[PDB]
Design a protein around this ligand. Structure first.
Ligand SMILES: C/C=C\NC(=O)[C@H]1NC(=O)[C@H](CC(N)=O)NC(=O)[C@@H](NC(=O)C(=O)[C@H](C)CC)Cc2ccc(O)c(c2)-c2cccc3c2NC(=O)[C@@]3(O)[C@@H]1O
Ligand SMILES: C/C=C\NC(=O)[C@H]1NC(=O)[C@H](CC(N)=O)NC(=O)[C@@H](NC(=O)C(=O)[C@H](C)CC)Cc2ccc(O)c(c2)-c2cccc3c2NC(=O)[C@@]3(O)[C@@H]1O
Ligand SMILES: C/C=C\NC(=O)[C@H]1NC(=O)[C@H](CC(N)=O)NC(=O)[C@@H](NC(=O)C(=O)[C@H](C)CC)Cc2ccc(O)c(c2)-c2cccc3c2NC(=O)[C@@]3(O)[C@@H]1O
Ligand SMILES: [Mg+2]
Ligand SMILES: [Mg+2]
Ligand SMILES: [Mg+2]
Lengths: 212, 233, 222, 125, 196, 195, 84, 204, 222, 196
């Protein structure tokens, strides 16, 4: 599992893979690791499949309750802190989760929070979580800049997920892309790693390490 | 129960054309000691069900108490308790199975393997199995413990599939059960020569035979066994 | 693995299944478990398959050398004693459980050897995972003064019970008969009950289905 | 333990205890609030003006629930203290779980809900 | 396993069951637990079948060489060989042995070697898993210098009770009688010693 | 552990806290403020197990702010330290104790004096001229034992803290990505912009 | 009551990935109406003093309007007026 | 963790009409981290091919040892070693370290130079001779390869069809294992011609 | 200590076509290296054209099946006999499974049916409830053996169009019920050949817009 | 662990090694050369358990220098890599195995080509365009997968290595106090004096 989310001039870029494994066995490669909390809040999962999926859907329910109660969208801070307090109430029980809550509000702007089962909650600009977070982090920090275009930032997120899928054995399948702006989240397609790798190799002159 | 103490050995059972047959030893084993002889491990419920239990004898007696209490409670306010609303084998099974799975999920199981065998009200032969894990399955031949390893292969040579059940007679099935009991007495250290046998037949009812003994044993060739290899005398 | 041995009035038969499993997965669907220690002394093995093969081959080599040295026919008691002492030396760490039968100048012989180095003698014996089923069959149908066909049928039925009622034994039945006045007869696939049905399809891919990046002719000569 | 239904309906459709609480309110000192274009003023009445009274320590009619919300009351002073404590606790809890001070509407709704629960619970007035 | 050896006027008689078990399964229900290390020196084995067989083979080899060199061995000599083998390899063995022999000088003698390698000469020796159940019966029924038939009956009753109560013992009762007249092999079947 | 340092200077208390939070083999953040303003004249830096730290800090902050609103009065630093110590001492023998260590620095206005308290997750409170949590002290204390002086100025305290940070960056196996330095005095709490 | 309704609705979504039927929501709301009395789970002292018009739409029974009283009873009206 | 599952990899051999085929994955990695995309596991001595899956260092050591032994065998016998003889040699060499085994799963394939018969065989880590006429599989994805082979294989395939079958089996089994993949090679072997092909597969 | 879990083997398979779904399972219930029964079905019809199978621990599987059937009964009771959507059933099964997040049902769960648009659909659940809608999914003992085959023959993985220079994938197409029956039969014959916990019999439930029908086929009994 | 990186560019091999040695909670040295010149055209960087590293490195150095003197010839990088791999593979099954991972960079003069080998303490040898030991690769590899190019120059390789070091210093929990950078080419081995 490898997920990344980073802020730039055009809002937030989010990019995940789709591989879920049970040890050496690739259980599935059609896993949607971005949870659409609401048209303005996204949740990226990493770790416990059932844990993350169930609790992020529950977070979406809680956000709907907050919106109905206060007649106002829930803030990224409050949305992340709900799940943070939940997992901390379940701390030491056996939960394994590393998630990123990304959103755009008028009060906060674009905002990204990292929340794990240990109870940590961190507001940040660039986050990579999962077994292959290191390769992502590498490519990102090497090619990151706040003045990226929407196109360039989407391409950078996709390429970081691609590198993490290549190197890390537990990450792969396909890349799911998302752009979070003032108007909400926009899905930018599901790209099969099998074809995306060859495309990037031919178009970039990179991945010269592969025999293909 | 966390560890069994006094335990009963295998319980074997099989279907035939008009009903079912079950059998079990009369032995209560205190580990490696054959402590209690004359321990009935076949509990007849009604005129149509028999429950064969292996494992912790205390839990078997608890299940006996539960079966008696279930009969008593079914008799309450039931004018047809002696007829259409009597205790069916499927009812008794499902109850025992729910109990076993509950006690498993509470981490305090009944250290037993249970085989419920009887005839339903419509003449159907019921024969099913449950254990301390609550696992349930039903086959034309059912055995517990060593029986599952030795009795079942012999009993399947008579009824290897459902279609063989109408062809098997009561004599064939009973002879097979007695032969399997003899084989168990041969090759089971925690077994006894005295056993009990129940027949639930959709026409003759419940036939319960106690104080049976394994007979026609072949031991003469033991005189020709001398030494463990090269010894000649 | 299900191995059995039955002595009849003029010799001894051994039989086994043909299933080698790497845990819960079948690895060989026709494994030969009958090993030749001597032209008239055979052995069925169960347990660590490599251990059984190695110990049978080593004792067979030693038996051939001993028979050349003494210019006499190898005796089943000799193979029995050597196997016993070898297995006991290794404190049972050689996971080989054997049923060794044969015919020598002293007559017919049938023994069983436990991997820790213990030996038993009898007219009918069985070992392996499905040993219990086969032993139940034996105790049900065995009698004294069996004919050749009677002992063959008994051993084959024991192996069949092992195949049908044990997850660790399956495929086909192998048999080896050893009579006093004749040569040993090694019937491979004496019974082939587990034959696979015809597949509902033929998955012969159309050529060009697989994508290839580079080809090369390999030089195998000099 | 004590769950006697004190606030119940009357044959004419009236909850008497609520109206008598309103009457107790009508017997308390006066309080007023006025909204400006960019400010809010709260005025309160002092019980005449006694001379043996120490005005430095006696609680004032206006109490702060948070740094940005104030509360005046009319009626029984003790019930006012209870409501003020509950409101301050809820304001701090909302700050803790939302990382944002409460709105006047939210605090007002919380106080109203507390009072409504007290009008429909057993063993309490 | 239930084994015993009893001395009497005419010599000695060993008795055992025929049940070799791996756990709760009867590995062999016709086992010959009475092993011979010399013409009139036999041993009852209990415990690890492999260890007992190895010890018995080595003791028989040593006694055969002793016979070829220095003449017919004494029962005490076989007992000492067993004792050395068991005591020097106590950490890797699990064998209880009862060595019974007959000679013209000492008539019939019985030695017992439990775990640890100790050796004790007794008028009668009981050992095995079942022996624990027949301690009282044997202590109350054993007599000095019984007749052949009385010794056979005593061993039969003791081993039958042991087989009845002990699930680790069963099969048939095997007996070997060593007297001046020689070696006699007796067998008793379940349909006879169960009705005792 | 993390870098949590505190030094009590004449008329001020300075608190330094590492900016790095690392989970696994990746440094997740390099700009983490490990402090919480309990009151306008009392700050608390914290470090320990992930999750428990911020939870305990914000809980203490909420309780102190509730006490401040209820009484319209600011608790003395001594009282806040005693409250935090009692909370930790009740926590240690609970089902899941808080594993957080805290430094509390505050300017007591009724005494017009700076105060610094060190409390571990067990509830052992001490008032020290300088304190540290984790392995940091194992170095810094020595320096202070040599360089501390009671009549120091706030700038001299900042220079001493810079010496401590240099020693840590030299001889510590972990890269804590600098420190956030805050000063608590009679005029409240400020944050040194360039350290 | 409104709270109990709203949560229930969202909960039916969370448990079933679909919108709750109008009649089901109205019935769940009415389940609170007669949850009053003395004794004691403690229940409220008095029934509700408010009536509700619950309007909605689902794919099963189309557009629906329900009247909910503190009597625990609810009706379905093509049109309904409550109050003065 | 497990010695055989540190590096990962898969090898599969199949037979057909007057031909054999042996394919392997091209991945070498330290558990999760992938290191090399060029780690082939099929070596050849004369006309006998051996694929070795398992602990990489043991793979290389056994390759060098078998090269050594086959060279000395050719020098002493003045002929190339046959697949059956080489299989016996592999079994004996494996069992020689019975109590300190090489954590590998060898697979021998080839065509007997004299009889012209196709021969394949497999072993465990202690040398158990597993000789099958259809297919032999080994590696971390042994179960996936077993399923793919038992489903797709049919006897008497021509080289062009046997190649497609073994390639599809290898690829679809590697896509279901995280520790195998990153490339693949397939050798198709006839009596006097061996063709080596690098397959294209997903690189994750 | 008492071990509250056990494995009964078994293998289940689920495929979704154009206007139909199919859920198949082996009828062999086993324990350790012994067979408990040769016909103990585990693919059940629950109503509303929804077939379910939770393979693994037999006790937990039966408990989960009973709980889901009770849940559909109460869903009919409490919502005016409204039809339970397949996605709704999947969500409810996720919640059922996650209810024992810390004492899970040792079962892999697979349900099959038709979606709101009347097209075939399968849903897969790990033992704690992570659910996913798919077109093919195998679970149980032989899952690792069947899943790649499906990927090759249902989703056409690694299959490029011949001559397209490995650039054009094989056109993905919906399969007929006859084709999925062929694939299921071949998968289960292979599983019976190579896995010792699979065999005896294959029972297939086919869910179309006309309802649920059954097909039984014999399997090897080794 | 320590940072051990290597990158093979056209006509050069670059090796980077941590400068920090830390025992306990104290950094003992910040200028540690974790390399040994096996031969004028073959360098080896190493990292692993304290003690074993320098011991194994100096042992390999002594053996390579002895072979160079004996034959008056420099072994190709392939031969040195195979020898050290065999040494490690013999060590793993010894009583106390060497826990050292090595990168070997050399300019094959008979082929006039740069070569880089990666071997772990197990004896797993690989020829890679770039390699790393420990956790370092988990970042650096990605960068290389994007930025490596076969026709690069030594300066371009140094810039890529600097990028890798920057990423490591950004996202690594440990402060390895920079790296020593060495270049191996046709003219031998040289050391970049100032890298950051
Ligand atoms: C979030 C995005 C991708 N998620 C993953 O990619 C993760 N995969 C899964 O959770 C698989 C998926 C599947 N089978 O569909 N499910 C299980 O394991 C499930 N059962 C089992 O553990 C069992 O059998 C038990 C014996 C009985 C229930 C549930 C579970 C339980 C405890 C855990 O601590 C984890 C998962 C866990 C947590 C953190 C990371 C990972 C985990 N488990 C791993 O295998 C992984 O490592 C991988 O990262
Ligand atoms: C014909 C005689 C027996 N027939 C069988 O069919 C027996 N199988 C084998 O001996 C297989 C055969 C093969 N092709 O490898 N050997 C291994 O698995 C080898 N281990 C390995 O490779 C591994 O470490 C992998 C990780 C796992 C596949 C060697 C080994 C190691 C420890 C053991 O305790 C046994 C074998 C063992 C001993 C007694 C009985 C049995 C054993 N193992 C079982 O699986 C069986 O139960 C079966 O009875
Ligand atoms: C001497 C006359 C009758 N002897 C018996 O009748 C005895 N049975 C056997 O020795 C079986 C026979 C067989 N062919 O299998 N052999 C083994 O157990 C072998 N170990 C194995 O199998 C194993 O892996 C496990 C260790 C055992 C399940 C050899 C062995 C090793 C260590 C031991 O401490 C004993 C035996 C041991 C000692 C005292 C009594 C008994 C023993 N073991 C028991 O099983 C018994 O209880 C029974 O009394
Ligand atoms: Mg990957
Ligand atoms: Mg893979
Ligand atoms: Mg099978």
């Amino acid at each position: 599992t490898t997920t990344l989310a980073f802020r730039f001039q055009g809002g937030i870029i989010v990019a995940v893979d789709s591989r879920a494994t049970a040890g050496n066995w690739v259980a599935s490669q059609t896993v949607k690791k971005v949870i659409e909390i609401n048209p303005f809040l996204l949740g990226t999962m990493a770790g416990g499949a059932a844990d993350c999926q169930f609790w992020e859907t529950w977070l979406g329910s809680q956000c709907r309750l907050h919106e109905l109660r206060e007649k106002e969208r829930i803030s990224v801070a409050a949305a992340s802190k709900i799940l943070s307090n939940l997992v901390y109430q379940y701390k030491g029980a056996g939960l394994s989760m590393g998630t990123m809550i990304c959103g755009y509000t008028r009060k906060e702007g674009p905002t990204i929070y990292y929340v794990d089962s240990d109870g940590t909650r961190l507001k940040g600009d660039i986050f990579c979580v999962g077994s292959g977070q290191t390769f992502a982090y590498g490519v990102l920090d090497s090619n990151y800049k706040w003045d990226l275009s929407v196109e360039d930032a989407l391409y950078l997120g996709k390429r970081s997920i691609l590198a993490a899928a290549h190197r890390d054995a537990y990450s792969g399948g396909s890349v799911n892309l998302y752009h979070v702006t003032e108007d909400g989240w926009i899905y930018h397609g599901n790209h099969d790693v099998g074809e995306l790798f060859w495309k990037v190799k031919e178009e970039e002159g990179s991945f010269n390490n592969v025999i293909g | 129960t966390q560890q069994p103490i006094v335990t009963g050995t295998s319980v074997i059972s099989m279907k035939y054309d008009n009903g079912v047959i079950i059998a079990a030893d009369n032995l209560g084993s205190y580990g490696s000691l054959l402590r209690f002889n004359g321990v009935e491990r076949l509990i007849p419920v009604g005129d149509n069900t028999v429950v064969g239990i292996s494992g912790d004898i205390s839990d078997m007696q608890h299940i006996e108490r539960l079966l008696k209490d279930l009969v008593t409670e079914n008799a309450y306010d039931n004018p047809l308790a002696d007829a259409e609303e009597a205790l069916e084998p499927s009812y008794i099974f499902e109850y025992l199975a729910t109990v076993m799975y509950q006690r498993r999920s509470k981490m305090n199981p009944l250290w037993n393997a249970i085989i419920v065998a009887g005839v339903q009200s419509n003449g159907d032969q019921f024969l099913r199995y449950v254990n301390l894990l609550g696992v349930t399955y039903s086959s034309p031949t059912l055995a517990t413990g060593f029986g599952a390893h030795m009795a079942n292969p012999l009993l399947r040579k008579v009824v290897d599939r459902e279609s063989d059940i109408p062809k098997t007679t009561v004599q064939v099935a009973e002879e097979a059960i007695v032969n399997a009991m003899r084989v168990l007495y041969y090759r089971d250290a925690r077994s006894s020569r005295n056993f009990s046998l129940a027949i639930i037949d959709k026409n003759t009812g419940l036939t319960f035979k106690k104080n049976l003994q394994v007979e026609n044993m072949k031991w003469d060739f033991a005189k020709d066994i001398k030494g463990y290899g090269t010894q000649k005398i | 693995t299900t191995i059995v041995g039955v002595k009849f009035n003029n010799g001894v038969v051994i039989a086994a299944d043909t299933r080698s499993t790497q845990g819960p997965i079948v690895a060989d669907k026709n494994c030969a478990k009958l090993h030749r220690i001597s032209p008239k002394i055979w052995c069925a093995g169960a347990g660590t398959a490599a251990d059984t093969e190695a110990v049978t081959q080593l004792i067979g080599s030693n038996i051939e050398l001993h028979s050349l040295y003494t210019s006499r026919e190898p005796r089943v008691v000799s193979a029995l004693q050597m196997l016993k002492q070898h297995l006991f030396k290794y404190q049972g760490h050689i996971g080989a459980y054997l049923i060794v039968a044969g015919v020598d100048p002293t007559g017919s012989h049938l023994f069983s050897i436990h991997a820790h180095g213990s030996t038993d003698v009898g007219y009918y014996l069985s070992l392996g995972s499905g040993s219990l089923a086969a032993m139940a069959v034996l105790e049900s149908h065995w009698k004294q003064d069996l004919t050749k066909e009677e002992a063959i049928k008994l051993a084959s039925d024991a192996i069949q019970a092992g195949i049908w009622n044990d997850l660790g034994s399956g495929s086909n039945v192998d048999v080896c008969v050893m009579e006093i006045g004749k040569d040993a007869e090694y019937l491979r696939n004496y019974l082939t009950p587990n034959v696979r049905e015809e597949k509902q399809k033929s998955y012969k891919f159309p050529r060009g289905t697989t994508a290839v990046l580079k080809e090369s002719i390999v030089n195998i000569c000099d | 333990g004590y769950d006697r239904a004190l606030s119940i309906f009357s044959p004419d459709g009236h909850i008497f205890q609520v109206e008598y609480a309103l009457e107790a309110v009508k017997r308390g000192t006066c309080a007023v609030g006025v909204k400006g274009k960019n400010c809010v003023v709260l005025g309160c009445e002092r019980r005449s003006t006694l001379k043996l009274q120490d005005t430095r320590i006696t609680p004032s009619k206006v109490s702060k629930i948070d740094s940005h919300v104030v509360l005046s009351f009319s009626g029984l002073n003790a019930d006012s203290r209870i409501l003020i404590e509950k409101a301050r606790v809820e304001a701090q809890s909302h700050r803790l779980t939302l990382e944002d001070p409460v709105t006047v509407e939210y605090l007002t709704r919380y106080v109203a809900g507390v009072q409504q629960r007290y009008t429909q619970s057993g063993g309490v007035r | 396993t239930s084994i015993m050896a009893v001395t009497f006027k005419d010599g000695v008689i060993l008795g055992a069951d025929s049940r070799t078990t791996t756990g709760a399964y009867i590995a062999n229900r016709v086992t010959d637990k009475l092993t011979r290390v010399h013409d009139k020196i036999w041993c009852c084995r209990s415990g690890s079948a492999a260890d007992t067989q190895a010890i018995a083979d080595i003791v028989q080899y040593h006694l055969e060489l002793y016979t070829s060199q220095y003449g017919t061995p004494s029962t005490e000599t076989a007992a000492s060989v067993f004792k050395e083998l068991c005591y020097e390899n106590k950490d890797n063995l699990t064998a209880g042995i009862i060595v019974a022999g007959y000679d013209d000088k000492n008539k019939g003698e019985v030695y017992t070697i439990p775990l640890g390698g100790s050796v004790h000469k007794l008028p009668y020796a009981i050992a095995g898993s079942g022996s624990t159940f027949i301690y009282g019966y044997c202590d109350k029924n054993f007599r000095e210098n019984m007749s052949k038939e009385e010794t056979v009956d005593f061993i039969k009753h003791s081993l039958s009770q042991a087989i009845k109560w002990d699930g680790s013992s069963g099969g048939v009762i095997r007996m070997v009688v060593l007297t001046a007249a020689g070696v006699e092999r007796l067998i008793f079947y379940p349909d006879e010693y169960e009705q005792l | 552990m993390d870098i949590i340092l505190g030094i009590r200077v004449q008329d001020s208390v300075i608190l330094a806290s590492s900016k790095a939070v690392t989970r696994g083999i990746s440094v997740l953040k390099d700009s983490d403020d490990k402090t919480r303003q309990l009151s306008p004249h009392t700050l608390m830096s914290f470090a320990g197990e992930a999750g428990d730290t911020v939870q305990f800090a914000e809980y203490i902050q909420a309780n102190i702010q509730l006490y401040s609103i209820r009484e319209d009065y600011e608790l003395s630093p001594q009282a806040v330290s005693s409250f935090v110590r009692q909370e930790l001492a009740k926590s240690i023998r609970s089902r899941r104790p808080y594993q957080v260590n805290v430094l509390i620095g505050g300017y007591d206005k009724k005494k017009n004096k700076p105060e610094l308290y060190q409390i571990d997750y067990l509830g052992t409170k001490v008032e020290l001229p300088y304190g540290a949590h984790g392995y940091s002290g194992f170095y810094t204390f020595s320096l202070l034992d040599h360089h501390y002086r009671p009549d120091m100025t706030t700038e001299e305290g900042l220079d001493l803290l810079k010496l401590c940070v240099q020693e840590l960056e030299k001889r510590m196996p972990m890269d804590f990505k600098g420190v956030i330095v805050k000063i608590v005095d009679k005029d409240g709490i400020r944050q040194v912009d360039d350290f | 009551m409104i709270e109990h309704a709203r949560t229930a609705a969202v909960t039916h979504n969370l448990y079933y990935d679909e919108d709750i039927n109008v009649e089901s929501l109205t019935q769940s709301v009415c389940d609170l109406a007669l949850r009053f009395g003395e004794g004691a789970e403690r229940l409220m002292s008095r029934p509700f003093g408010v009536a509700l018009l619950i309007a909605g739409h689902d794919a099963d029974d189309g557009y629906q309007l329900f009247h909910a009283e503190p009597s625990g009873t609810f009706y379905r009206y093509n049109a309904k007026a409550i109050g003065s | 963790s497990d010695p055989s599952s540190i590096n990962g990899g898969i090898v599969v051999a199949m037979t057909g009409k007057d031909c054999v085929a042996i394919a392997c994955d091209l991945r070498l990695g330290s558990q999760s981290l992938g290191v090399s995309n060029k780690f082939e596991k099929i070596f050849h001595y004369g006309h006998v091919f051996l694929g070795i899956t398992g602990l990489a260092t043991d793979v290389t050591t056994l390759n060098e040892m078998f090269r050594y032994k086959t060279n000395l065998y050719k020098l002493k016998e003045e002929r190339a070693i046959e697949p059956e003889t080489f299989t016996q040699l592999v079994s004996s060499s494996l069992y020689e370290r019975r109590f300190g085994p090489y954590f590998v799963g060898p697979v021998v394939a080839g065509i007997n130079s004299k009889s012209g018969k196709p021969f394949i065989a497999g072993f465990d880590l202690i040398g158990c001779i597993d000789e099958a006429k259809d297919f032999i599989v080994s590696g971390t994805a042994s179960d996936q390869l077993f399923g793919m082979c038992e489903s797709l294989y049919e006897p008497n395939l021509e080289p062009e069809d046997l190649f497609e079958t073994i390639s599809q089996a290898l690829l679809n089994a590697a896509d279901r294992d995280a520790l195998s993949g990153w490339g693949a090679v397939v050798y198709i072997i006839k009596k006097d011609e061996v063709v080596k092909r690098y397959l294209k597969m997903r690189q994750d | 200590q008492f071990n509250p879990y056990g494995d009964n083997g078994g293998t289940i398979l689920g495929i979704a076509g154009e206007d139909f779904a199919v859920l198949a399972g082996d009828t062999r219930n086993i324990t350790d290296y012994s067979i408990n029964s040769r016909y103990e079905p585990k693919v059940f019809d629950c109503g509303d054209n929804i077939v379910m199978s939770a393979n693994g621990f037999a006790a937990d599987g039966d408990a989960l099946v009973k709980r889901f059937k009770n849940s559909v009964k109460w869903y009919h009771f409490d919502h005016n006999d409204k039809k339970l959507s397949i996605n709704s059933a999947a969500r409810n099964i996720q919640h059922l499974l996650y209810g024992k997040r810390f004492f899970p049902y040792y079962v892999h769960t697979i349900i099959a049916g038709l979606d709101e648009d009347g097209k075939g659909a399968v849903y897969s659940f790990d033992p704690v409830g992570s659910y996913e809608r798919e077109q093919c999914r195998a679970g149980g003992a032989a899952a690792s053996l069947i899943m790649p085959f499906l990927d090759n023959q249902v989703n056409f993985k690694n299959q490029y169009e011949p001559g397209t220079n490995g650039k054009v994938k094989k056109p993905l197409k919906y399969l007929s019920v006859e084709e999925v029956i062929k694939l299921v039969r071949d998968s289960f014959t292979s599983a019976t050949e190579r896995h010792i916990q699979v065999g005896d019999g294959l029972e297939i439930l086919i869910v179309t817009k006309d309802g649920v029908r059954k097909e039984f086929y014999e399997l090897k009994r080794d």
